[PDB]
Amino acid sequence: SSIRVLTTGHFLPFNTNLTWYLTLKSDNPNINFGDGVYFGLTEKSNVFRGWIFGSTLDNTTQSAVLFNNGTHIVIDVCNFNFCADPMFAVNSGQPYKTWIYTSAANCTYHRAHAFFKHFREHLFKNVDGFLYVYHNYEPIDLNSGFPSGFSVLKPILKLPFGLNITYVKAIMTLFSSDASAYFVGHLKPLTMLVDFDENGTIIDAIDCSQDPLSELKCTT
């Protein structure tokens, strides 16, 4: 509380370029997993949910799935046999069938919970045989490309599996009877300077090595 410290780690650089992916009402590439990825999504009808982690995305190598079913958060690390497109089908406003994998065996993990108007953020990191997930939430305007501002993410869960994670994927939803977008960044090793309020809240942060003024503030 009420202090200015500086730390070194893997952070998203300020004023960096993301990638625009859209769900068309008329995509899920194998995004690389480096030192960590940042996921930010804008939705209105809860269309985007779920991720797939792995290296080969076949039945010769274990893979991890983490998704929402509309009533449960099913996460399990098994040897999956993923087909062409992981999907989610809803009929007349209610869910009736999920199409996310075909076969799964030799499976060593399982967990379950009970569960443009909004903006959702998710940051993933994988160090020392763990998977770190960070979450933040704020409502945004009716129509915008990327919501500009400043937000701080909070951890939710820490998953203990030792897996070779080099690629990530996305799980979509199509109506069987709207459109959305998500943005993906890439973490980099940088040095940051932060300040705390009289409470335990982070209010501002400066990315050094961006421009000479922030480098001067990093030195000072």
């Binding site: 274990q62 045989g129 203990p160 409470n199 335990g200």
Partner: protein
Amino acid sequence: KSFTVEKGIYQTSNFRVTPTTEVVRFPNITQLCPFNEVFNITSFPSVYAWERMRITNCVADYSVLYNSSASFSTFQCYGVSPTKLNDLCFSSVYADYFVVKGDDVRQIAPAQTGVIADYNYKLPDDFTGCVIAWNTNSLDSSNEFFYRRFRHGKIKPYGRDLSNVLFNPSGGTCSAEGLNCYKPLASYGFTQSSGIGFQPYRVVVLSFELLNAPATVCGPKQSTELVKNKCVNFNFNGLTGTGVLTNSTKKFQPFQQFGRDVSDFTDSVRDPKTLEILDIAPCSYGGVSVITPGTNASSSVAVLYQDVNCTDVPTMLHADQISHDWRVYAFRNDGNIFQTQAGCLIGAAYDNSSYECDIPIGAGICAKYTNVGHSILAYTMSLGDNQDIVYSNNTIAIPMNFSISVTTEVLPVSMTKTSVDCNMYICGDSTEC
């Protein structure tokens, strides 16, 4: 560091001590930790397919292992002493268990090489935890156990792979077993009476995180009723120290347990056995100075305290935990205790007259050893003598005589010159250094 002091005022360094009561606060956990479920499960996996389990809501009382029939050939702990495992609290504890060859027990250590350390099971260089192993030749010598022998790289410090694809030593996948195409999984040869480096061993590896998160597994320590507004030596989840504890108004998120200030000192804490934030402060405070009129003249002294109010002194000068020679200085029956602008002077009498300064105390107060029998007397410094001169606009003063005066002024000019030999000081009669 002398037996005879000179006249003046000095600073002291708090040679007293506070032998107060102890408090101990540990979480409300009574379930015994499953030591039997881990060490007596009679089904351990292969090293290439090791599995991990979590430990929560435990009491780590390993002395019950003396009640069983388990003897460990290897028990080595890294980053912590084995004698301090009964007093600490751990936040996240994971146990990894498998079966190893017996000559590869030495490879379960940080910064190792071999088949197991490269392809099967690795540990990070900065590893905190303990490694336990024992021989199970009478149980695991009639079962199939495997290990990975061929790989195209080295695994992560915490990672496993269960792939069973065919290995080609230079290229992709051969997809046809034969020449230059081998199965990467080799089988341990576990036969009866094969030696001692070829008999199966059961290995368990524990990992802890210390004093950085709320803790769920602790040692067998009995708690104590919490006290407040007195400085005590405490123990909160394995965090020791001494000081007063007071109520605090900071509420933080439930993934935080401790609180550090600028100097990295523990100032704010949560509590076990209840949920309440507390502030800790040291109970050593204030400046103490002593005044003595020499040693051969007398043995009595006067003590002043810079930052106490001299009407409610003994709250900071508690005379119960110290000697009677300090009880006579904490409170005085007669008027030998009074408050000055520099603090609270005890043991000296105040005077309304003003003289020249003898022993400077501060803020215009001086002291001296006087006959008014003999005692320490404090007084206000006098700048000089008044003259009450008057102004006349038609009168001048003119001297009518003169005198010749001789005055002395002494100035230093030079100082002693000294040469220093580097060796014969750091060394001398020693050619090794």
